[PDB]
Structures are given as structure tokens and as C-alpha cells.
Amino acid sequence: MNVIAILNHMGVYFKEEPIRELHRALERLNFQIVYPNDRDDLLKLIENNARLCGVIFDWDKYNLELCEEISKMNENLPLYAFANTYSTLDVSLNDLRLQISFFEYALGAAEDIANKIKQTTDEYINTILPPLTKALFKYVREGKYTFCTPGHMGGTAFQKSPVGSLFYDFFGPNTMKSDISISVSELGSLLDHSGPHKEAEQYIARVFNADRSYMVTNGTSTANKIVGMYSAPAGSTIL
Amino acid sequence: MNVIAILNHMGVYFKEEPIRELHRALERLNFQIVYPNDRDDLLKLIENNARLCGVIFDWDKYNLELCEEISKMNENLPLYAFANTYSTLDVSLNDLRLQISFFEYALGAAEDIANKIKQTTDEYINTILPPLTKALFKYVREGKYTFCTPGHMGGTAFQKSPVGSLFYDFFGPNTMKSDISISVSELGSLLDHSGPHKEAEQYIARVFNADRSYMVTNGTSTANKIVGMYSAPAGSTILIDRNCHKSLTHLMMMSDVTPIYFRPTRNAYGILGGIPQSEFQHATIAKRVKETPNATWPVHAVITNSTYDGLLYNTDFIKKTLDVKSIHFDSAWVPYTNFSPIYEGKCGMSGGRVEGKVIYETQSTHKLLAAFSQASMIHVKGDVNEETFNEAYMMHTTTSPHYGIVASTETAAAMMKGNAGKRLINGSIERAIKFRKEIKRLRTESDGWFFDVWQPDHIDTTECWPLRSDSTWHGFKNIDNEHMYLDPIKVTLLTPGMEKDGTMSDFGIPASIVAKYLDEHGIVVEKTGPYNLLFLFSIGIDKTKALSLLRALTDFKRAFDLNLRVKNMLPSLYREDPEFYENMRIQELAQNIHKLIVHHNLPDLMYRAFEVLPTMVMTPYAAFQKELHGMTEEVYLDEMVGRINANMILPYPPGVPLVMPGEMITEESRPVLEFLQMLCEIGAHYPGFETDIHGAYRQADGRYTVKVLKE
Amino acid sequence: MNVIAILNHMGVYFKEEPIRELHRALERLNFQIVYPNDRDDLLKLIENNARLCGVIFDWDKYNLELCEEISKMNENLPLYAFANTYSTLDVSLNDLRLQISFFEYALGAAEDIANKIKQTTDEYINTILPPLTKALFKYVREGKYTFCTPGHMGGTAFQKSPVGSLFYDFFGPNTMKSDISISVSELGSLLDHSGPHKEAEQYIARVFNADRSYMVTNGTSTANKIVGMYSAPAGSTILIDRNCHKSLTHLMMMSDVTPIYFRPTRNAYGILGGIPQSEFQHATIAKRVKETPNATWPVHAVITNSTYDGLLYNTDFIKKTLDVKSIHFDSAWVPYTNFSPIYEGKCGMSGGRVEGKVIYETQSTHKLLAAFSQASMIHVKGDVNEETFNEAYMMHTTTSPHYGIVASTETAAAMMKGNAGKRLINGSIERAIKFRKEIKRLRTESDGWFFDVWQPDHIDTTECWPLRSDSTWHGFKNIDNEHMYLDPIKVTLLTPGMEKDGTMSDFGIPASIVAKYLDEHGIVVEKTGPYNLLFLFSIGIDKTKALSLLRALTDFKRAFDLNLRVKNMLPSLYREDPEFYENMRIQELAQNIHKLIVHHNLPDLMYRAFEVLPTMVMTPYAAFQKELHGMTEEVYLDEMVGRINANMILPYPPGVPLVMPGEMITEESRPVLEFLQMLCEIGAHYPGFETDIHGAYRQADGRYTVKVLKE
Ligand SMILES: *Cc1c(COP(=O)(O)O)cnc(C)c1O
Ligand SMILES: *Cc1c(COP(=O)(O)O)cnc(C)c1O
Ligand SMILES: *Cc1c(COP(=O)(O)O)cnc(C)c1O
């Protein structure tokens, strides 16, 4: 997730020069820059490419041809449209879910714009991800809780055995660090149904239209036997 | 400041080759080179980009299309125009302030041209900056004076402590070196009023049209106490306005004076109007003198122009009818009524010197300008004693002023002179009027309810809209004509909830709910409460911050029409009480609060609690003296009829004082006490909307207690 | 803060290879790598270099030589010690605050180690900083709030004007972004005393040993007015010291109180001592009450501890003999009498809570510490009312404080906490005692006259030298034992010119000539005049600024013994009058001024003028009321016997008040007027050394005029 789109070329210099200054500032924080062509070019960069999170275009050029087609696909994609002096909204742009970030064409302030894009991108990551997954990714980058199960502890024992180094370098460092048990306080437990695990049951049942949705960790073949041991008395009758 | 512009391309080689040689010479001295396109390209590099100082163009190509448009934006802007053999000036280029530097197209002399541009740029910096700020910047680069105050001495002690290195590296090396005191000879002292500080006081008064002006380093709240302690002896009489600030109340509590409160006008939405013209008469002021025990002739008058909302007065009528030798205008919200033709004769500085009188103003600096906090001014228009007024200024200013704020106080005045400063006031007005038209355009075309702007039906003109007597938008009963004006930059948004006659309605959304939604995206509401919203459109609000407010208003209608949840809209309000705000939606909360306003009747109790002034027993100065002795007690809110309060009641909403410290609530001020008991019931059922009254302490049962004086 | 230290070299390859791999990984996250030599090399990288936060060393090599010396300086300093297989702790390493992070020498895992160092470094930053400063740094990096105050909003308006870009590019981007008001929820408000501002009052009072410490944002001159406006009702009685500051005089002119002036001790050199122990008795205070009309029992006492020269008193005797429920200590020059064992029982905060009394102190911040200007504190030691004292603090502090100074006020209290902060107090004392020994060493070994330090004959000890009764260095006649102390960091250089008995000599150089000579190299004398030179040896004076002062003193003896010209020695004085100072040398100017002091008799006319007290007719508050009406006139200096003055006379030298506003010069105070007429004659012959008296206006003939009240 580091693709920034810069659509259209006004042909002037006071608008393209800030783009050239921003081109060298976004690459310092690991971000790919793409230059789409016409309106149909930007539409192909959203359905096909899924690692996009930034769309830069002139607000006084396509204010109704881009704010409608993008909202039908991704209703939370951060838009980095650049407005002008005589810029305004439209009456047909009220019932659309968008995230437009306005800016200007000022020289020297390209460094401050790069910090706002990185902060806005972090807000999009924290929104599309559930709170249970957010706690797992944050524990890897921020988490030094030792003396906890499992025994590998993010792949510590694999760095001592020669055969264990081949199994740790196959998946990745972030793979073994995300394999933790219920030995963490800020993540709760699955059997306790509290904390992040409590909000996960309400987030799945609401989207899938249900009242109480669980998470079976042994496939469907095991989940069928859980229901069968609830409404089947001894010597009764099942269909 | 290192941007050099090279406009156009002649196509020839004897003119473009010196440009290529100069391109490699200017980069050696840290200068950015830009290549604009046509004539409209260079015009966009001045209004948007402010770090530009060099314009290179052919003189025999655009000698009239560039020398006129640039002169309308900046006067001292250097113009590095290249002339030819058959080149001359124009008759239409005599009354224009420009700085044209001629050169040639000689090869090999590109190094000598770069030295001339660097010196010209240095002369531009030493000219547009005031001598006080210029001497401060030169002292940092050239200044090795030791054994001086403060103790940090440019950040010397911070390099020895491990924790001090994090605080020094945050601001910068040039930040701590500029924080010096009066231990410098070539910069003078602020209390001495000599040297660079003497020329700075005469420069600020010339920009803001005044005779003498000081630099208060403790905000406007302190500047109001310096003037009040100059024309109000012990046992005199002052004419302070009712809509006073928290600092203005302390002025009455620190001086043994007998104030006379006025009766400003107001409507039903809570918008503070103004003082009628009948209160400024001679028979009206003299009538309240005999009725008030221990009161002589008023020798000072305090007028809050403008108020907290943003409604100017008419100084052309006050300076002639009001017979007060010391008239004060608390200009804590209009530090710009000078550099615009639609603001002539609206403030105290606009006009001439009034004989036998004097005008005082406390223009705020860190409010609607661009400077550090705790900065104010004292504008004096008249003939006052210099040896007497100087002693009153030292009673509120320390002997070691912070030059980091003093340099910014004068900088805000230097940013206003010239065409580059006039476009900041007019630029904010054009962006404000444009935002006013975007609301009326998205109101009729929309399908449903929409926000409204407290403005007349005709806003095509570009001036202050007068509050006439044949209009229905202001809603003021019996208002004086040509006395109350409207501030264009002070856009007052009205939320649907009330009618045009002052009653209520079935469908309505309070302004307190919208204020919480704006804080989520990052919008701070200045004033909120019943059905009104206030925003600040100063010179710092550019086109990005202005358009960000309209998008947040359109998103509130979408989330309300679709009936969303509180958790999926207001995450900050959900964290206050997740149990109560669980199964509650955005339409259930907006309708339950609206029914409480109609049931408790807010517009009627608020309008009748501010007009009837409570009986003032003693002076506000005597109320604070009894508190220091220890004769104070805490009683309940329902048990206080006939007692003398100790503090000032500042209920939110709105934001005006209710009972002054020293008054008594008798049988005449009955609706005054009913306003306090009404807010305690409406602000106790739903979390997040608690009652906010400065003076009422919350206990453990819900009943608020106030501090009164013992009998 | 990005210095990582790697000590020693094992010589093996399995330990040095991970060091080289980590060298290429730490540089990717901006970190400086250093390689010290032996054990003494690492110790020099902590005291001198404060930007260090990482020490890498072998655990099985120096487990006891490094874990003890480092803990004595910085306790929270992270230690990246690398252990081995057979590694263990020590019994002598239990009572030491350390942060040891164990690692291995695994290849390829250098990337994971770099992430742990960056996370550990972030923990050190989020620990040594107070929560109020932590919220300010996080708001700059993370903050998207629009429509806030002030109008600049981190420098938005400065990017639109050409003159505004020069003021924004000087400080830095992070400077203007940290200047926000009380419009932020996650930072609280200063007037509300909640959130981060609530924990800041408990963090400063705990370190400085207090119960309620506030943050004044207008210097010490304003904090003294808040204390006086709390325990001094109208028509009461206060015990203010005679050697009061300019702000302390205005406190008496703003409150209708009856002050009682003391009679501190003094010598002939101009160094004022302190209040004797006989003035604190019950028979002395009650005697002046009956003699002074309209005066009751004193309820507040203002004690200047220490004075302007730096002389500590004895609080162990005042808190028991002085029967005042509100004893104030003006600690504007000793913000460190707590972090050293040689300062116990010398201030009001040292010790416990006095039964029935309260201690109020206004310790300065931008005087002898490291913070922005206009910063002070209010220390409360006792059981007082919180709701009553809160109203007095809001009468001098604006509603929109400057967080750039508030963050620096609490930072000064955090830079002194811990052993890393205590080394700055003890380090400044060791550098001060060393400077005192260098003067006596260069005095006897030299050939001729040399400067002298006002210190006892025995300075081998490291403590405050008491002023005994059997000594001749202090010169105070009839002084109380164990009452007056000496500040070691307050070195007073006594220039030759007077004897040890109080009379005059034949060969000497006044201190006024030396004061201007030090300014040529960049040294400003704090206090000069007769034959004294006061300096400040705070934490800002490092080993470079201390040694530079002695070198400038040795150059004055060389230029005076060789008899040089004024033009080739004092170029600043020569530019004032090149015609008069043409054929004049350094010996002719030094001998002519010395004869004028003996002729006019300065020590006798100064010791007798400041000793007696003029007849106080009315209170200082009533003197300012008559000035506002306009009954003030300007009379000559020779025509004022029997009149009432309006301003305070502050003659230079020395720098202490002479006549308070509201007193009368009759037949008893005859030497008082003789001191003013003597300075008008000695300061008129030679330019540059003119008479400097705050209150006397210079005319066109030479005679100074003062402002008195009309009869
Ligand atoms: C495939 C299948 C299963 C097994 O699914 P798993 O998730 O692998 O356990 C169970 N029931 C039915 C009807 C299936 O088709
Ligand atoms: C905001 C305001 C003040 C306080 O301004 P500061 O400069 O922060 O002291 C004082 N008076 C009025 C009328 C105000 O609106
Ligand atoms: C220097 C001084 C002051 C003034 O200090 P500021 O912080 O600049 O206001 C006040 N009182 C005393 C005793 C001083 O020495």
C-alpha cells in the first residue's frame, strides 16, 4: 500500500512544479508514484491495482467525473484533490462517501504535505482493519513481553538450531511474531469472550446479518459437531 | 526567500545563453530557479508563493502588462528586467512603486551579476523589516556578549543536560539565541522607551493610524487593566459595557470605582446586539447618577467594539453624543479596520483627533493575525500626559520582556503596509462572501433541511451590511438605523430549529450536536449553544481551510438523513458512556434534545434573564475585599434569594456575564435565577451535554452550589 | 539525541562482526556511532556530551567499573550491555538505577536489534519529559485541527506574505506549530487547572518541595503582585523590605495598605546587608504601629531573600520570631536552594510546614536557569483556600497563555531532577570556588595592584560562608551571628581604591571604567558603580565562559600599567566625544575620577542617606490617586524640601530605592537630599559617566527636575 496517483496535466508551471517537488518527497517514505493518462486510466488503477491509497487531480477540471465513479468502488479511498481560488462543491456530491484532502500550490511546503499524506494513510489502515487484527499488527512492532507461550516466541528458538533456520526464513520475521497465545493482556482470550475478541463477534454478526457469530479454528467439519451437541438430548430424535 | 523567476523565451541565443550561465551561478548561493510560462503563470507565483524576490523578463516584450499587475501586489519587489538598445519608459509608469534593475547580455560577466542580486536581496530584507526585528536577527549572527540574562544564553545550559537537549533541538538554534533581555546596549530597553524601542512605537502607530502605541506582552486581558487604571480614580464613575470579558470584570474588582452597566440589545437566537443610541445621551447618563449611591460624573467609558459575535458600532455618532473625555473601544476582534475602504469611520482610529477627548483601543494580536501568543497593543488618540501614562504601563509589564513575542507584535503591523498587506484583509473578505453564497446555493437546490447564514437576503455588495429597521433577518426589536453593522468575515451559521418570529418548531437540530461532529474531522467551533455557530475567517484562513468547512457540513446531512448510529459517527462521544450510547442513533438523540428545549422553554427564559439587571448593592471592588477576610460560604442554588454573590456567573450558552460579583437577586430579578435552575435540569440526563457555568461547583447529588458572602 | 557508544574491543571475530553489522543498520535511522578508548574515555562522553543515549560494552569485561560511575550521573540512561553464556549479576549492583538490555552475537539478526534500540530510545524520551511537554511535541507531529487560535496556526499566514516568510524561516517549522491556545481538548487549559496542567502543578511542587506551585507567564515582577493581593486587605498593614524591586513598589501603589519599611544593614562599598534580628521582635514591630497613623496588626511580611547581590538570610530564626501568618520570601535570585546539602534550612521551602503560618515565594525562572523569558512560579507552603487564591491568579494572567513559555517553565524543574541535574548546581559551585582561588593566586604573585574578591580569608570549605562578628572582610558594623550568609556563585570583585576601615585611599580605579572595558570583548557587568563588580555564575556559565572572564581582567592591568590611550583601548567611549577624549590616556582618566570621589565624599553621603527614612505622610496608594487627577508639577531639585514626591527615586549607583512615592523630605532627612545633589555634579564633567537616577528629568541647563504633587 504505497501507490500515489497524479492525474491530468494542466500544462502550466505553477501547478506542475509542486508536483515535481512532491515527487522527490514521497519517495523518501517508500511510496510508488504513477502518472495516469485520461479519466479511463485512473479507473483501471483502482479495480486492478489494490495497493493504491492516493489520488491527486485538479479539482477545477473533473469535479463530477471522478467523485462519482470512485465512490461506487471504494467509498473510503483518501482523495488528494487540489482546489483553486474559485472552487466549490456540487449539489450532486452530497450523498457520496468520500475523503477529500484539499491542498495548495505553494513552493517549499512540499515536506509538510508528505507528512500529511503519511498520517492520512495511517488513518485509512486503522479504519479498514478490525480491532482484533489491529492489536496483532501493533504487538509485532510494539511488544517485548517475554516468558510467554508459544515456546518459539516469534522465532527465537529457530535461531539456535541449524535446521530451524530454514523454517524461519521461509515464512518471514513478521509471521512467527504474530503467533501468540492468550498470554497477552491487551488482546484478551478467545474462551473469555472479552476485549478484542468480544468486539470481533459483534463485527462479524453485523456484516453477515447474524446475532452471535463465533470463530471455529478447526474447519467446518468441527463446527458441525458443536451445534449437534446443543439440541440433541440422549435418546431423542434428529433429522 | 530564494526564488528567482525567469519569464518567457525570446528564442534567440544571445539572450538565452546569459540565462544558462546565470542558472549555474545563482545555485551556488542557495537560490531556487523557476521557469514560468505565459503572463498568467508569473501572476500565480506571487499571490501563492511568498518566498519569491527575483523576476527576470524581457523589457522589450511586456513593458506594460507586467509593471502594472506586479505593482498592485508588491511595491518593493525587485524586478530584474533585461533591457535592450532601443528601450525606454512609458508615461503610464510614473505613479507606480517598482524596483527595476537593468542588466545586459554580456558573456563571462555572470559572476558579477550574481553578486548584485545577492546584495539587492539583502537590501530587500533590511527594508521591509522593522528596525527592531532587523536588529534582533543581526544580533544572533553577530553577537558574542556573555554574562547576560536569561540564564540559558542562547541554549548553553541545554547542551549539558540530557533532557535539555530534546527541548533545544525542537525549536532551533536561532530560536533560543533571539530570546534576550534588556542586557544589550544596541537594542535598548522596553521600559526606557529609547533606541530601537522608541522608533518601533512610532512605526506601529503610523501603520494603524495612531499617535502613540505600546506593546503589551501579556495578551489583551492585561492591556485592558492599564487603561482602566488611568482614567478611574478611587471613588469615581465609569461606563463599562454589560457584555464584558473576564478580564474586564477583574478591572472593577481591583479599583474602587462605581460602574454603570448598560442595556445592550439581543434577539432570540442568542446573538448579542449592541447598546442603543438612547443610552449615550446626556439625560440618560445623568439620570442613573442620582439613582446610584456614591457616584459622581462619569470620567471613563468602556465600549466593546465589536462584541464576541462580530457586530460593529458607529463611532461617528458616539464621538459626538457621548460626553466622556476617556472613551475606550475594546477592539479585541477587529485588528483590521483600517486597510479597507468598507471600514472607514467604524473604529476609534478612523478619523481625526477629537478635541477634549481621547480614544483608547486594545487591538488583539494573537487572535486574528499572525504572531506569538500574549501580545496586545494600546492605541492612544489624543493629548495625554506622557509622564503619567508611562507609570501605569509599568504596573503590568515585567522589566525583562520576551523579545521573541515583541518582535512578532511589530511584525504583524509590518505585514499590513503596502499592497501585500491589503490583499490579506480583502482576501479574507472575498473568501467569506464566497462561502456565504455557497450556503444559499446549496440550500434551495438541496432536498431537505440545510444550514442558514445570518445574513440579509441581498449579499451581492461587498461592504458591511447595515442592520436596518425594515428587515427580518436580524430579529432585533426596535433597533437604531445606521448604528449596527455586520462583519462579513464573521459568518454566523444558523441551524434549523426556530422560526422567524422567535418561537420554536417541531423538527430542529441543536447547534451543540453539530459542534461535536466538527471536532471529529478537525474543526474547532468558536461559539456554540442554542441554534447558532461562530467561526473565525482571519488572514490565516486560506482557501484550503475555508473549503474544508463546507464539506463537513454536507457530510452531516448525509449521516442524518440515512439515520446512522452514534458509534459509527461520533467515536469520541461513544467513549464517554458506551453503555448508554449503545442502541442510540443520530436521529433519536437530535429529537430528544430538541423536545427538552421546548419543554423547559429556553428562548423565553434566556431573553428575560439578561434584560432585567439585578440590584447592585455595593461596588464590585468591595465584594473581593470581603472574600480575603474569610467571610464566604457555599450555599445551594435554590437558597440564595437576597444574598450577595462573590464570583461572576458566566453560563454557557451563551457567554455573557449574568450576575456581577457584588449584586443581589431580589424580587425584580426573578427570571435571572430561573435561568440557572433551567440549565441544571436540561444538562443532567444525557452524558456529554453537562451544564457549563463558570461559578457553580458540582457536588455529589446534582445540585450546584455557589459561593456567597456571610451576613 | 542519536549518539551510540561502543566501548572496548574483545579482539575476537564472533563479537566484532555483529558490531560492524549493527554499524550499517543504526545509520539508516539517523544515529551517530562513536568509539571510545578506555574506561576513562566513556566517562567523558556523558558529562560533556548530553546527546548520548546508547552504550554498548561487553558484560564479561567491565561489570563493576561501568555500572557504578554511570549510575551516579544518569540513572535512566539505557545500557546495551552484551552478555555471554557464563554471565551473572553482582551483589553490589542491587541499589543502582540502571537499564540493561541483553543481546547476543547472532549473525543476520542485526536488523531486529536496530528496531529494539529505536523503541528503547523512544521510551527514554517519553520518560524524562513531563506530561505537559509530551503533549506539546505529539500535537505538532500528530495534529489536524482547523479553525483554531491564534490566526497563524503553525505559520499558515506567513506563507502568503513576502515579509512574513522571513519571520517564519528564521525560527523553524516546529516553533510556530507549538504555539497553541486553550482550544485543545487533549492538552487542557491553564485557567481550568485540569488535564496536563493539573499534573504539572504537582510535578513541580514535588521536586521543588512545595504543596502548590503555579506557572506565571509574565516574569517575576508579576508574581510578586499576586502574593500581595491576597493577604493585604484595604487599610491593613504589610511588612515590606526597604531594598524592594521596582515591581514591589507598584504593589504598594495599587493596594490601600499601610506598609512599614525596615532598616537593613549596609557598609561603605554599596553592598546592602540584611534586616537585623532585632526588627523581627515583637517589641520592635508593635512600636512602629502606634507611631504610624492608620495602621493595625501586620498580616503580611515581604522579605527579600536573597537581595540583588546574593546574600542568604536565616529562615530558621524568622519562622519562629517573626509573628506573621503570611511571610513572603522574594527568592528571585536563588532558584536552587534544595538540590544541594549546603542550602538546607536557608529558604522557605526547606524544612516543613509552620503551624499557623504560610510561606509564599516567587522563584524566578528566566534569571539563573534555562527557559524562555517571562516565566515565574508561586510556591505555597501551608493550608490556604484554593477557591480564594485562584481568583487572584486570574487577575494577572491572560486567558490564552503562551505554551512555548509554559513548556519551558516546567522543563527547568525537570532539568534539575535526579543526579544528572544536581551536577549542574554542584558544578557551578565548583567553578565558582575555583574562580575565587584564581584571584587570590594571581594577586600575591603579581607585581602591582590586582582585583579582590569579597570573600573571607578562608575559602577552603565548600559551603555558604557565614558573616561573623569578628571579621573585617564584610565591614558591616554590629552584625548578628548566624544570620547573614554568602552565595558562592555570587563573586563580587572589589576594585582597589578604598581601605579596610571605611576611608578612602590614594591610588585606585573606579568600577565604572572597568564596566565599559569588559563590554568591548562581550562581558556585561551586572552591578557596578562605586568599587564593586557583580557577576552571575549560574548553570549557563560553563568552563568556557568562566575562564574568559579572568583573561579579560588580566588585559586591563596590562593596558593600564603600560599607559595606553583611550582611542586604542576604548573605541566605544571615543565615539561619544572624539574631541574631548583625544589627548587623554587610561591613567589620566582613572586618576581624575578618583579625586572627584574623595572631594565630593561619596561613601559618607551614601551611608547616611540610605540609612535614615524620610517622613512618610500618606500611603503609597494615595500618592498615585492624586497623579491621575492632574495635580502634579515639575520642580527643581534644589526646591523640594517639604513636598511630596510622586515617583520612586532609584539612583545609579547603587541601585536601591531612596524615596518612596508619597514621602516628604523635611529637616530629619537632610543627607537624603544631599546624595542627589552630589551625583549631579560628579556626573557632568566627563562624558559617558552621566548621572543615572530613575525619576530625575534632564533639562537644557544641567539641573535635574522631579515630579511632585501640588499643594
Ligand atoms: C467441504 C465440506 C466440509 C469440510 O469443510 P472444512 O472447512 O474443510 O472442514 C464439511 N461439510 C460439507 C457439506 C463440506 O462440503
Ligand atoms: C479573547 C478576548 C480577550 C482575551 O484576549 P487575550 O489576548 O488572550 O488576552 C479579552 N477581551 C475580549 C473582549 C476578548 O474577546
Ligand atoms: C530581576 C528581579 C525581578 C524581575 O524579574 P522578572 O522575571 O524579569 O520579572 C523581580 N524581583 C526581583 C527581586 C528581581 O531581582
Author numbering:
A (entry chain B): 1 to 239
B (entry chain E), C (entry chain H): 1 to 711
Paper text:
Building further upon these results, we now present a higher resolution cryo-EM structure of the LdcI–RavA cage in the presence of ADP, obtained without symmetry imposition. We show that the complex is built by five RavA hexamers arranged into spirals, with a prominent gap (or “seam”) between two LdcI-binding RavA monomers facing either the top or the bottom LdcI decamer. The resulting two classes, with an overall resolution of 7.6 Å and 7.8 Å, respectively, both display spiral RavA hexamers bound to LdcI, but show clear differences in the presence (Class 1) or absence (Class 2) of density for one specific LARA domain. The distance between the two LdcI decamers is about 10 Å larger in Class 2, which displays a 6° tilt between opposite LdcI rings in contrast to the parallel position of LdcI copies in Class 1. A pseudo-atomic model of the cage was then created by flexibly fitting crystal structures of LdcI and RavA into the maps of Class 1 and 2 using iMODFIT27. Therefore, we opted for the usage of a spiral RavA hexamer generated from the RavA crystal structure as a starting point for flexible fitting in the cryo-EM maps. While the RavA–RavA interface is retained after fitting, major differences are observed in the pitch of the RavA spiral, and in the positions of the four LARA domains contacting LdcI. Indeed, these LARA domains (numbered 1, 3) undergo massive rotations when compared to the crystal structure, whereas the LARA domains of the RavA monomers involved in lateral RavA interactions only show minor movements. In the LdcI–RavA complex, the RavA spiral seam is oriented between the two RavA monomers that have LARA domains interacting with LdcI. This results in a seam that always faces either towards the upper (orientation A: “seam up”) or lower (orientation B: “seam down”) LdcI decamer, and never towards adjacent RavA hexamers.
